[PDB]
DNA sequence: CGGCATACG
DNA sequence: CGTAG
DNA sequence: GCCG
């Protein structure tokens with residue numbers, strides 16, 4: 001039929017059930033704002049099943065046998081098919097709680113727990129936060145100052161410009177190091193809200209200490225509007241040129257040794273749901289523990305060597321999916 | 329019923 | 338607590 | 343919320 005794990009099926013970026021999947025994703029997001037990770041996962045998984053179907057769902061009949069469709073998710077789809085709207089979804093959409101939690105958690109440096117505390121304190125707007133700046137972290141101050149630019153979609157044209165700049169700094173920091181585009185743009189997205197890069201070097205060990213050297217060089221070139229500072233992940237805000245001005249862009253930089261590069265490439269290419277499902281599959285179906293550093297057999301107490309993403313899918317007994325089919 | 333990814337800053 | 342896919 |  002339809003397999004139960006998202007890593008077992010191709011999921012393209014564009015598909016035939018966009019409206020249905022978007023509605024279920026609203027309910028998933030709302031569940032996350034209420035701390036119900038289980039409900040969030042079911043609604044995310046149900047949405048992803050629809051993304052993987054070969055044609056539009058027209059009749060409730062067509063949901064029979066699909067994994068992750070039970071009474072609740074089927075009723076949502078039934079209302080959308082019959083009336084074009086689901087009352088529960090529309091109620092969530094217009095709710096003050098949903099709109100405020102969405103606004104607050106979109107802030108770089110603000111998670112669900114912080115947003116919820118602010119909501120309970122009575123805060124509702126960005127200007128509310130700006131009027132009490134002593135309660136903010138430096139990271140949150142940065143996220144709030146740059147929030148407007150960070151709400152503007154990053155375009156593929158923007159990505160090519162950023163990659164050349166990152167390569168320049170990486171080349172001075174360590175000749176021979178390479179820069180690979182990851183995240184949503186590697187999956188074929190035409191827009192995004194950040195750019196993700198993975199950096200390595202072909203000689204194992206030479207990447208040790210690389211990211212501080214890369215960051216200092218970017219910072220000396222005036223391109224870093226914010227970053228946290230030894231480390232291997234950097235979540236920063238870049239200054240990106242624009243016609244007669246510039247805009248702030250979120251950029252994630254990650255370093256891995258070449259021995260781990262296939263695992264890090266897999267992990268950082270996503271999607272987020274794809275990776276959660278793949279790690280769940282590995283552990284629950286194969287008894288293997290997967291992360292962005294490796295794949296561990298806890299019985300033999302050994303790590304799998306991988307030279308490619310293809311190797312990792314083979315180790316796990318899964319058909320290979322290119323990045324553009326990992327859009328779970 | 330228990331489980332729900334798995335890390336680093 | 339934040340961040341990431 | 344759903345699966346096994």
Ligand SMILES: Nc1nc2c(ncn2[C@H]2C[C@H](O)[C@@H](COP(=O)(O)OP(=O)(O)OP(=O)(O)O)O2)c(=O)[nH]1
Pocket residue numbers: 105106107147148149150151152182183184185189191192193194196269270271272342
């Ligand atoms: N400031 C701001 N942030 C936004 C807005 N819309 C979304 N975001 C943030 C919230 C999320 O953390 C993030 C989602 O970005 P993307 O959809 O590009 O996904 P992400 O990069 O998380 O994953 P991906 O690399 O595609 O697998 O963007 C907005 O209007 N303003």
Ligand SMILES: [Cl-]
Pocket residue numbers: 035036037038039040
């Ligand atoms: Cl839950």
Ligand SMILES: [Mn+2]
Pocket residue numbers: 072
């Ligand atoms: Mn229900």
Ligand SMILES: [Mn+2]
Pocket residue numbers: 079082083
């Ligand atoms: Mn009706």
Ligand SMILES: [Mn+2]
Pocket residue numbers: 183184192193194195196
């Ligand atoms: Mn991204």
Ligand SMILES: [Mn+2]
Pocket residue numbers: 183194195196251252341
């Ligand atoms: Mn990112």
Ligand SMILES: [Mn+2]
Pocket residue numbers: 232293
């Ligand atoms: Mn590491």
Ligand SMILES: [Mn+2]
Pocket residue numbers: none
């Ligand atoms: Mn994200």
Ligand code: NA
Pocket residue numbers: 104105106107108109110111
């Ligand atoms: Na946030």
